[PDB]
Amino acid sequence: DLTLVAMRTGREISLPYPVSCGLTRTDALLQGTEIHVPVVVKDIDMPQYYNAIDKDVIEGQETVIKVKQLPPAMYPIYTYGINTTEFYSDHFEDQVQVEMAPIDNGKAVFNDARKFSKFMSIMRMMGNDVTATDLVTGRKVSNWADNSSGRFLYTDVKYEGQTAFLVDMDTVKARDHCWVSIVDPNGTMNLSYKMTNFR
Amino acid sequence: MAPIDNGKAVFNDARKFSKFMSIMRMMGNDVTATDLVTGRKVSNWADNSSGRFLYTDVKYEGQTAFLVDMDTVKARDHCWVSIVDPNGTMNLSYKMTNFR
Amino acid sequence: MSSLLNSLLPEYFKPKTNLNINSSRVQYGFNARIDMQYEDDSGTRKGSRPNAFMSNTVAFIGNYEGIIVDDIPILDGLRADIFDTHGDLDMGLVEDALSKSTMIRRNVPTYTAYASELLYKRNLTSLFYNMLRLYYIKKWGSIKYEKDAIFYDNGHACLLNRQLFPKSRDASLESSLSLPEAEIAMLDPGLEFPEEDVPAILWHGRVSSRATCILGQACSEFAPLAPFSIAHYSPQLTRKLFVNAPAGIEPSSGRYTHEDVKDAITILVSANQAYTDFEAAYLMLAQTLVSPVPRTAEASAWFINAGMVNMPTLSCANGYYPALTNVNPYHRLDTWKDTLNHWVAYPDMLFYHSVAMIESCYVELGNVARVSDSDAINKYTFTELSVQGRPVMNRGIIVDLTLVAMRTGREISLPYPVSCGLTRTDALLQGTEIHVPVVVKDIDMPQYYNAIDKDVIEGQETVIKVKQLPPAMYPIYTYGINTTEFYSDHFEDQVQVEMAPIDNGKAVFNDARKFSKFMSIMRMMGNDVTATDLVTGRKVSNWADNSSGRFLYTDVKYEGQTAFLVDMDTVKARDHCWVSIVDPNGTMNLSYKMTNFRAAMFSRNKPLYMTGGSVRTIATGNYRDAAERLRAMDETLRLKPFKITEKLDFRVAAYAIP
Amino acid sequence: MSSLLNSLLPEYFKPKTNLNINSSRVQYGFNARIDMQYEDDSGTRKGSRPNAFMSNTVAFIGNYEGIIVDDIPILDGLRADIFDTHGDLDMGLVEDALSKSTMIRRNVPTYTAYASELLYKRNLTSLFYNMLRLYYIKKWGSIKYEKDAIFYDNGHACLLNRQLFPKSRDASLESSLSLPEAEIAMLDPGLEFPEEDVPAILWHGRVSSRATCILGQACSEFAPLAPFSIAHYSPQLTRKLFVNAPAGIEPSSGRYTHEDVKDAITILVSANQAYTDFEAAYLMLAQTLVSPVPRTAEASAWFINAGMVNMPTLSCANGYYPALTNVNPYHRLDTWKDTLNHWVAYPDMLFYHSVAMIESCYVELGNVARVSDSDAINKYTFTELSVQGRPVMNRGIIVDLTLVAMRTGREISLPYPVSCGLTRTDALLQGTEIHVPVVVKDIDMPQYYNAIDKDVIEGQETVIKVKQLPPAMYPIYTYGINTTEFYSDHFEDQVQVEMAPIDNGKAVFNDARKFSKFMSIMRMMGNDVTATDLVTGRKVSNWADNSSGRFLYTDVKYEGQTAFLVDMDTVKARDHCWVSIVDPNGTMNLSYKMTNFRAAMFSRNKPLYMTGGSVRTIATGNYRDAAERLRAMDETLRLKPFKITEKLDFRVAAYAIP
């Protein structure tokens, strides 16, 4: 636990005695096997999003989700922009440039995985419900997959494969309050934000 | 060359897809790919008269990703250069002489 | 040792990750372009072979037997403090190391006494060997062995799988073995006296239901039905195996996927710090995995008698004393985790490393067999002069790695002098003619082969005599890295020979070297010439091997001195380029160039294509944060190469120190 | 002393830790390449044996009998304060030391009075000796002894195990002894007056359940059934043994392994500070671990009567005076812990140290038996002039160490002049005829051997009269380090036999020296020569051994005038790899050359290989440099970080060191 803190802050932690007592967290990681978490369903269109065991499930049924790679359990908040990585993208200033031509009728394909993550994340700050669909596999991902942080990490796809995300920009829905509207875009889009003060 | 997973190679970029099918045509390999957005089959052997591949043979303005069928690569016209299984970075250098 | 066997592959070839093997036979070669130029007294002629396929054939069939022997301990993974200023294990410091890392100090005198006896016999190489074999049985578990199939087939003679492998039946690879399960018990912490002749191993967290079944079957006896390379007979490793797991082990499931065996190996190595033990097992499997299909019928003499695989005894004392294994392990080389990191990333790459190793051994044994038994370096005393360490016995891997050094001409070095694996030089080290059993296909068989019965009928089972062992394989991957006169595997070469006077329709070739050069030219032009050996009275043919398009002098099948009567009237035209002429006149000059190499693999008379992505390099430098190279070149194994010095005889080979 | 016995081993010999002995007979030796030559007026005939095996057979049987004798006290261990300037117990500082301690005040005056007698009872050599024998009995317990087995056989004469060892039943070494346990009582600290004639020892913490069983059996009578060397007859050391352990003595377990005996020794030496006592016990066992199988039939005279082992009486008064032993002991030599530290690390090395000592002794007693009594340094007075100390009696280890000093040609130094162990020079000093029994095979025996009967039918039990004792072992480990002309153990040697054509093969050797070299070199060449003495009329054969393959002059079995007729048309070729003497004419010149040496061991007519780690030369400095180091790295858990680095893919993470 102390060696993980040393990696986060980026400093040298020193104790007087090399004592080895307390909780061990790295248990499910080192096993390197599939884990079967139980879930009770609410809607009927669940198993498209989550990697479920059943393909058709009536509401109020107890199902199982197959988790292979462990997603992050917490988002950095106290350690925000002290040792920044491009995965979490916990910057004060950030921008993304999605390049579209008028010949394309709103439909954009993200060949790159990095800028797809930043587009889907900044659109959620702006209070827009985007629903992308993978062209190779045929699954779907939604940027609204959290009600705490309000960011989109790439591990919300729940699948490691080839990157071909079709996003249709005439099915974008305004969900939250205090939001900027994308009524009908034409040409190159440039999104950007700035965090100024903290309380 | 894109990684061949089962018997299919995903070409996400547009420029790389144009260069790939342009090489395989000069070697003389009738390759058939599936456009993932539309769901229609493209073929590099569209025009027989002029022995070249233009990107307009896809017949879809806009952005897409192609799933190339690497198992069903037919051998129409074979010179000694002609290979079926590409591996890594493909280099083709040709010279045209003796016009009449 | 990944970096060693990876170097053997040719510079042009870089193989992809996956390879879907779906048969018990794989051809491997290259498609080269030959530009021949002919000149004689009549005039000049220029041609060009546009596509020429030179290939060997390798199979998954080889009769092997396991023996449990006592070998050296691998002292890698133990904490660095117990070792003194030199590279030696001091029992004075083991007492201190165990004392400081406990509150209960009553048990220190007892713990030290048992530890001193067990540390000098620690070896997990035999356990990883069986775990690796279980991985490949599950992965390639759809390969069929038919009993009434062909082994070698030329046209005159034939060998079936009934012969060479009696006591065999028709079975798939998954159907070959029905392994039992050894008792995987839990070591409760509190037991004071380690039970003797039972090893104890560490584990990360809870032992999975699937991990139990793998460890149970890995320790059990292997009893095959069909002869397979990766299912050979092995004795029982242990009866019990303790596992010091804080969380209790689960009962055995019964079934497991090939993916589950990877998870079992990755945990077992990481916990025990047994990285060098894995490197030994990796090299040990590279020898066994594949076996050569013989070039000619005489080259079946190698694979009659069952070669012995020396499996080290399974012992480990990490479970009892987990204080000795800590966060600061002792290692001799800084590149000591490369072999595992290579396998876990690219499992199917072992096939290419195995083909590269067995080729290098069986090519160089072609030369060692021809060495006269009245020189400094001969078949008996070639290993002993080469090695510069202190192993238990010059057996197993030491013999194989000595032949790789002689091939490549570079100094090979391992951290520990391990003597574990297959010994090939058994048929070689005996002054006796070997009786290869064969089947007669054509009535004129006794004229070609040295048969017992001089009159035969199509269908009869006879026996042929082999005195000197011919080469089993031709150089393909190791083509032109160092060229001997025997093989003549040049890129560019100018062959010059003087044609003998054609009296009636026959040309007498009294000299041995001139005869070899003549038939070598006529083969490259593509003329099937047949000559009569005057001493024996048997017919030789340059078209002996179709796969590799070259002529070796061992195709005559007569050690000693002779004169050949070549039939110049009956020169058939099998393959004709524009260079190809039938009537040579005076001094024959042939100058050829080989360009445009490209690797190709065939399986079941169709092209076998490589799948997956491109292999990115994984490799660690000589230093991580180490200041001074403390040489420590006393215990490390070193193998010195020998260079072949050609002499006038041509039939005899001779080695010298470079 | 591990140091002096280590130097006796050859330079080419590189020993390993473990040696898996599974029999009661070992043929230790070396493989050498002999280049023999026979020059003559007609021409030269060259030979070459690439692997020539020169061996000395060593067994685990030998009749010995222990007797309890009075020996000097060993004062190493006691605190350095009580000693004066000269180095003897200054009584007055003892009374001062006891007064300023944690002793009961009413016991001080009565205990101080006894000190004058009890403090000079310090000799634990007998206890350590018995505890070392228990270690090797349980380790090599599976070795067998058959009653009707062949002790010696040379074709003509045979000597069975029934002949030398009557009252002998066939049994395994483990099943030989049935040791009864002596009482191990706890010393009451509040005892009125110390009980002399009852030894009291110290212990660290609690006496374990197994330590009671080991100490109980160590201080008991050895009454064996089979005549084994490490299970010979010993009297009862003591009836009762006190142990000053505040933590109570647990009752006897009954069973124990060989590892538990090492635990018992290491606690006993550390508590009592008795390292010099252990060094004496190590050298004692080195003599009487293995006995040599006789080279010739008439060399069995050494092992007819049982040689007495001198075990010093068990006497220790540390239990009564705990204050006088502390962490600052008095020692003469600085390297006083080296012998124990060597044994704890490498227990099985004692086998090599044992054969080195007996081979050194029995070689020198060979060429000591061939000196006339009328001389300065002779049979009786070779020990007195060599010894420059003050031992009680010239017996035990003093006689064996002085013979080693003569062999190697160096000065052997011990800290205390202790006189305990086996005495070998018994049959020599008697100077009388010895009557060895023999069972005959052929009917023409009594011409060769000096037998009691002149006509004896096959299968009869006869007697041979041995007057002068022949050498029991040939020098092998000490080959060409201190060469004498008797053994003729040179690397290069030649002999010139001068004959004229007028003589029809018959040569008479007037000289005795060159007759020995001719007969010896002819046996290397594999030729069976049979000479006949002209004066007496007896016969000698060069083939009188199947181990070394040399001819010593003591094989004549008679001292007289030298006139040996050898007929050189009755020479028969016996062995393989031999040069032929078909028909010689003129002067003969024989010669050989030994070039290289490789250590080899045989057991049950199979190769015995050394396994385990590489044995080093342990020095006092190699451990105490790690004490100087102390691991001075302040024991503070400093965790260093890793900065994550992003690259093209971004899906997978990569950590850097800085």
Numbering used by the authors:
A (entry chain A): 400 to 598
B (entry chain R): 499 to 598
C (entry chain B), D (entry chain A): 1 to 658
Task: Give the article text.
L-BC virus persists in the budding yeast Saccharomyces cerevisiae, whereas other viruses from the family Totiviridae infect a diverse group of organisms including protists, fungi, arthropods, and vertebrates. Totiviridae is a family of viruses with monopartite double-stranded RNA (dsRNA) genomes, which contain two open reading frames encoding the capsid protein and the RNA-dependent RNA-polymerase (RdRp). The capsid of L-BC is organized with icosahedral symmetry with two subunits of capsid protein, named A and B, forming the icosahedral asymmetric unit. Decamers of capsid proteins are stabilized by domain swapping of the C-termini of subunits located around icosahedral fivefold axes.
Furthermore, we identified an open particle of L-BC that lacks one decamer of capsid proteins. Three-dimensional reconstruction of the open particles, with imposed fivefold symmetry, produced a 10 Å resolution capsid structure with one missing decamer of capsid proteins. The opening in the particle has a diameter of 16 nm. Overall, the structure of the open particle corresponds to that of virions and empty capsids; however, fifteen capsid proteins, two B and one A subunit from each of the five decamers that border the opening, have smeared densities indicating their high mobility. The three subunits are located further away from the particle center, and the B subunits are also shifted away from the hole. The total displacement of the border subunits is between 9 and 11 Å relative to their positions in the complete capsid. The icosahedral asymmetric unit forming the border of the opening contains fewer resolved residues than those from the remainder of the capsid. The structures of capsid proteins from the empty particle were fitted into the other reconstructions. The domain swaps of βU strands between A subunits related by a fivefold axis and the existence of open particles indicate that capsids of L-BC virus are assembled from decamers. Furthermore, the open particles may be assembly intermediates that are prepared for the incorporation of the virus (+) strand RNA.
